[PDB]
């Protein structure tokens, strides 16, 4: 056709296919699930590699002492927004000498990414940022989109084959506001074990888990310290 070339061009139905194609790379990235308790926020990522000698690509990135994110898309734009994210933490920490409110940060992210979605010859950002953080109001789990329409939630999932993880979260979401970390994390592992082929699940080098805690700095756990969390789970029913 011809309504499928530029960001400025509206569809006759009013649905811009450039943004609709920017919603594809977030479906092309690997799956990950975020969630929160009353007092703790946990997000669990699923690594990928290309050859078995090649290392697995990380997804969980440390932003601040109370802010951590996950990605799904291209790593270049992931780092491009990430450096802006670190910058917007440390400058206001420099000015007001205080941590930064997460919703106020994400509003700045949406205002940041809305701008190239309206000019000419300007792509949107292909990324799927799940955001975990603390205000004074405890845990907050946010998700983004290339259409710059950020969504508050209590648990979400993005990446390839995430709908099954959503179906797991809907029938267990009532439990989540009481249980603490040692079973909350493996609830998230029961989310990520769903989205897999039926033979391989959790082989201790393909997974990472990040936690911000009510008196605990945001900590990334990778291919080792995962093994205390990873044990004590049931076998996959078949």
């Amino acid at each position: 056709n011809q309504y499928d070339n530029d960001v400025t061009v509206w569809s006759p139905q009013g649905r811009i296919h450039q943004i609709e194609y920017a919603m594809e790379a977030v479906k092309q990235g690997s799956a990950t699930v975020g969630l929160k308790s009353k007092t703790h926020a946990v997000l669990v990522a699923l690594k990928r590699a290309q050859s078995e000698l090649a290392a697995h690509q990380k997804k969980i990135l440390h932003v601040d002492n109370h802010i951590g994110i996950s990605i799904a898309g291209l790593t270049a734009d992931a780092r491009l927004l990430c450096n802006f994210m670190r910058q917007e933490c440390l400058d206001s920490r420099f000015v007001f000498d205080r941590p930064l409110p997460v919703s106020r940060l994400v509003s700045l992210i949406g205002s940041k990414t809305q701008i190239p979605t309206q000019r000419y010859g300007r792509r949107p950002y292909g990324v799927g940022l799940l955001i975990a953080g603390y205000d004074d109001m405890g845990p907050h789990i946010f998700q983004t989109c290339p259409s710059a329409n950020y969504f508050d939630c209590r648990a979400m999932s993005i990446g390839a084959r995430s709908q099954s993880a959503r179906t797991y979260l809907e029938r267990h979401m009532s439990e989540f506001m009481e249980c603490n970390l040692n079973e909350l994390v493996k609830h998230g592992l029961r989310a990520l074990r769903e989205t897999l082929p039926a033979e391989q699940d959790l082989t201790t080098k393909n997974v990472s888990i990040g936690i911000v805690g009510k008196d605990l700095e945001f900590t990334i756990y990778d291919d080792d310290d995962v093994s205390p969390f990873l044990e004590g789970l049931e076998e996959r029913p078949q």
Partner: protein
């Protein structure tokens, strides 16, 4: 007309130990002929293994401190590890030189450990030059403090002086005596002595009262 500089007093001191380092300073912020406060420490825990002291113009001490605290996190987010002591000195030399034509009115001494558990003291001019020394006094009464440490620590001008390395307790009573001896003559010497100690285990603090003229 409008002057941009003023002198806030203060006097800091660092001594490199064998497997430790001791950074100490008084806690008086004041200028003119008056006292602003009797509580203003100059100890600053940068890492677990690095403590900086900052004397001179107080607003530049605050600003420079916060800029350093930013650039550590910039390094760590860049490199997934912490800075080392010589890396901090090598950075802050460039930071001080970066305002060559409008300098900070700040004296600085960095105390801390190496990668091998040894004391390291780096003293700064207000422009950005430095060296690694065993012990440096900075501030107002540094002229009162340096030759005493040259005699006791450096063993200078003594005949048949043996050379025991400095024990930690001897260093402690050395500092606690010498700040009293400076306090009896300098007007800028404060009323309480914040002492910070960097070991292989962590950071210890201790505060000793002084006279309060």
């Amino acid at each position: 007309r409008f002057s941009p500089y003023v002198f806030n007093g203060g006097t800091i001191l660092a001594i490199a130990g064998e497997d430790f380092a001791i950074v100490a300073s008084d806690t008086r912020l004041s200028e003119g002929f008056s006292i602003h406060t009797r509580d203003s420490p100059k100890c600053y825990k940068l890492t677990d293994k690095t403590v900086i002291g900052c004397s001179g113009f107080h607003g530049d001490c605050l600003t420079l401190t916060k800029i350093i605290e930013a650039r550590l996190k910039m390094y760590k987010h860049s490199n997934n590890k912490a800075m080392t002591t010589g890396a901090i000195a090598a950075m802050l030399s460039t930071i001080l030189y970066s305002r060559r034509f409008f300098p900070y009115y700040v004296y600085n001494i960095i105390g801390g450990l190496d990668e091998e558990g040894k004391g390291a003291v780096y003293s700064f001019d207000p422009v950005g030059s430095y060296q690694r020394d065993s012990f440096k006094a900075g501030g107002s009464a540094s002229a009162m403090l340096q030759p005493l440490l040259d005699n006791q620590v450096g063993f200078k001008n003594m005949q048949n002086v043996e050379h025991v390395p400095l024990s930690l307790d001897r260093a402690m009573r050395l500092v606690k005596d010498v700040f009293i001896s400076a306090a009896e003559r300098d007007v800028y010497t404060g009323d309480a002595l914040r002492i910070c100690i960097v070991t292989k285990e962590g950071i210890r603090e201790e505060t000793v009262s002084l006279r309060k003229d």
